[PDB]
Structure formats: C-alpha cells, structure tokens
C-alpha cells in the first residue's frame, strides 16, 4: 500500500521533528526512502524467518535484522 503513511501522518511526524514550515513537495521522496528501508527490513526478516524455516515472524527476527543493519533499537 503506497498511501500507508498518509499526508496528515507525515505532516505530524515532521512537526514532531521540529520544522518551521514544511513544503508540499517533500513527502514523496521521504515516503520513497522509508518504503525502501521497510522493504530492506522485511526482506531481512523473511530471510531469518527461514533460518529454521519458521512459519511465523516475531520480534526476535526484526531485532536481529535491525541489529545487524547498523540502526540498533532498544526498549526490549
């Protein structure tokens, strides 16, 4: 789904990011790069879901993908 992160959602994400004014031709490229990142992470997740060809994806898979992707995450 291309329009997952809709226009108001991206707008409030940008406002949370501390920007004075947000132009109307900036969300397309941001959406493209975040879709690329999402494709990369889901590809990795499905790869290690077949590490033991497990028929389910869990937090362990995605934390594996993200911890070897260089963008480490915490809270767990």
């Amino acid at each position: 789904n291309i329009q997952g992160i809709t226009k108001p959602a991206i707008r409030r994400l940008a406002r949370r990011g501390g920007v004075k004014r947000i132009s109307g031709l900036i969300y397309e490229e941001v959406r493209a790069v975040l879709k690329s990142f999402l494709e990369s992470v889901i590809r990795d997740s499905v790869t290690y879901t077949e590490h033991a060809k497990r028929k389910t994806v869990t937090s362990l898979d995605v934390v594996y993908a993200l911890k070897r992707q260089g963008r480490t995450l915490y809270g767990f």
């Binding site: 501390g18 004075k20 480490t72 915490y74 809270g75």
Partner: protein, 102 residues
C-alpha cells in the same frame, strides 16, 4: 550460594555458567566469575540513580520509560559510550535555536 561466597548482590554462578557455555576461547580463566557482573551492577546502579532523580524531578514515583531516556541522554559520557540505540517511548530532550525563538 554463590552470592554469599562472593559477597555480591547479582548472581554470578548463572553468569559464569553462561560464560562457560560461551566458550569464547580455549583459555577461560574461571577465577573471576563476577567481574563482568560487578561492572554491570556499577553501570546499572549509576543509571538507576540518574533515573531515580529524573523521576523525582517531575513528581513521578514510578519510573516512566521517558524518564529512563532522559537519564540516559542527559550525560555526555553515557551518550558517548552508546548513542545508536533507540529506546521505546522516545522523545528527544527539548531544544531550540537562536533563530527560531526570539
């Protein structure tokens, strides 16, 4: 058990068993089963003190994870020794520029 013999709060027998199962090298000196446990207790104790003062700052007896983020992000050394981890329930410390605000 092991804690009383070592005189240390965090268990080290389980930690030393995990280290032995690790088999990181052929030569694994077993004379210090609690050294890593000691350093982790020291780090976690200073982190807990920071989190406690942060939680007491905003009349919060219970440590909200935002308070933990503020505690781990308010020190130069803590952010220097790790700064690439995104903790759940985020929110950067407040900041402003000399051009955005008068």
């Amino acid at each position: 058990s092991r804690s009383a013999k070592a005189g240390l709060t965090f268990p080290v027998g389980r930690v030393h068993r995990l280290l032995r199962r690790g088999n990181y090298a052929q030569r694994i000196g077993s004379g210090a089963p609690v050294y890593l446990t000691a350093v982790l207790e020291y780090l976690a104790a200073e982190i807990l003190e920071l989190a406690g003062n942060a939680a007491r700052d905003n009349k919060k007896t219970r440590i909200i994870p935002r308070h933990l983020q503020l505690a781990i992000r308010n020190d130069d050394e803590l952010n220097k020794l790790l700064g690439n981890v995104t903790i759940a329930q985020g929110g950067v410390l407040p900041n402003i520029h000399q051009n955005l605000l008068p």
